[PDB]
């Protein structure tokens, strides 16, 4: 490495791995962490949480108009009543897609996403391309996802710059007469709750 140009040389991924282990090592040796504390976190975010929680909320709003109205009038109270509350999900707002309004959620500054309701964010949600572009050219970005909105549909992009979080409530698709709440939940995609997809009719 030429010392004029240290900034050209990234840490290799082996470094981040080594540093993670060193942190773990030191913290456990000093009594700040435990093996089971670390495991408990991993279990929670890799397995316990997920987008099925949001799916259940969407399916309930599609089935129960009174619940939908309450959800949109005071989503924080409603969501907490349902138990979908916790770290990075203390203040969750729901934004309703309509025929002429399409909502898309981002965290331009990082990756903020309501873990208690939706689980972990998509890979792409955290990366520069989506974050940079969606605020400026959301129609172009949505076309990459297969969603090509008419010019007459208004797009509202919600940038998660505070600890307030946002879930999209997508519209129920056509062709779902007779489908139960439980079966409707199975139709709700993660991507529809971020605004990068509509729900396909089954």
């Amino acid at each position: 490495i030429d010392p004029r140009f240290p900034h050209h040389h990234p840490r290799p991924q082996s470094f981040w791995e080594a540093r993670a282990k060193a942190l773990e090592s030191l913290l456990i040796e000093k009594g700040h962490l435990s093996s089971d504390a670390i495991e408990r976190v991993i279990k929670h975010y890799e397995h316990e949480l997920g987008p099925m929680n949001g799916a259940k909320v969407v399916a309930k709003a599609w089935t129960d108009p009174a619940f939908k109205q309450r959800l949109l009038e005071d989503s924080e109270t409603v969501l907490r009543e349902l138990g979908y509350y916790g770290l990075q999900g203390e203040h969750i707002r729901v934004v309703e897609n309509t025929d002429t309004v399409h909502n898309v959620v981002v965290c331009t500054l990082c990756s903020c996403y309501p873990w208690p309701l939706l689980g972990l964010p998509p890979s792409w949600y955290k990366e520069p391309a989506y974050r940079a572009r969606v605020v400026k050219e959301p129609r172009q970005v949505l076309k990459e996802f297969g969603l090509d909105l008419p010019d007459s549909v208004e797009i509202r992009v919600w940038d998660s710059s505070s600890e307030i979080r946002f879930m999209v409530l997508p519209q129920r698709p056509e062709g779902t007469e007779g489908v139960t709440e439980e079966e409707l939940a199975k139709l709700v995609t993660r991507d529809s709750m971020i605004g990068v997809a509509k729900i396909e009719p089954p």
Partner: protein, 227 residues
């Protein structure tokens, strides 16, 4: 800080790598899982970080070449390292030496410890969270429907005021209440809560572009001025 992390409105980052959700794996390496456990385990105990403000500024301080190459959970490792050394939880040299140990011998055994009380403490963070909502005695400066102009400020410390939103007219959409103020809290300068607002900006104002697009951004009171 006007850093690499503040990407909104940038060009050149290319296509979004779409993947079907069922194929979008969370973790491909155990160290990434470990990163999650380190962050939540430390934050639950207020070690190096009491909430997310301190967390974020450690990430934003990364060398730009590292920020773009480390992968996501590398960001998390960087900020844990940064904050634990900054607060005096870990010593820099000890951390470097131990990192060298694991670089040269990756299979070095990790010490094992069970602490069920710590597990319960971590669970409480996970489920009770860390809401930043506070009350203050002051009244909000702005009201719903008011047209504001965002400031020309350039904090060299942490801020939640994205560059693409600076020096812009917008309209107050909601007064949330007073939230812990990131620009101070990230630097361990006090919660100093300030009213937080959601503000709508039109595409023509943001970009000079012509489509029916808008951006809703949450902005603290001190980011804005009346018109």
């Amino acid at each position: 800080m006007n850093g690499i992390h503040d990407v909104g409105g940038m060009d050149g980052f290319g296509k979004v790598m779409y993947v079907k959700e069922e194929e979008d794996i969370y973790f491909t390496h155990d160290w990434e899982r470990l990163a999650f456990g380190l962050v939540a385990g430390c934050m639950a105990q207020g070690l190096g970080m009491k909430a997310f403000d301190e967390f974020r500024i450690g990430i934003e301080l990364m060398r730009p070449v590292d920020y773009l190459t480390s992968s996501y959970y590398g960001h998390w490792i960087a900020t844990v390292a940064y904050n634990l050394v900054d607060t005096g939880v870990l010593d820099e040299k000890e951390l470097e030496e131990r990192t060298e140990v694991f670089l040269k011998k990756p299979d070095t055994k990790i010490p094992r410890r069970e602490d069920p009380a710590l597990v319960k403490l971590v669970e409480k963070a996970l489920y009770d969270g860390l809401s930043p909502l506070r009350e203050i005695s002051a009244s909000p400066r702005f009201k719903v429907g008011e047209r504001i102009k965002t400031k020309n400020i350039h904090p060299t410390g942490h801020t939640r005021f994205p560059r693409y939103a600076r020096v812009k007219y917008g309209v107050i959409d909601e007064v949330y209440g007073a939230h812990v103020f990131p620009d101070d809290a990230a630097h361990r300068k006090g919660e100093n809560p300030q009213y937080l607002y959601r503000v709508r900006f039109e595409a023509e104002e943001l970009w000079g572009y012509k489509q029916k697009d808008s951006v809703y951004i949450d902005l603290w009171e001190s980011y804005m001025e009346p018109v």
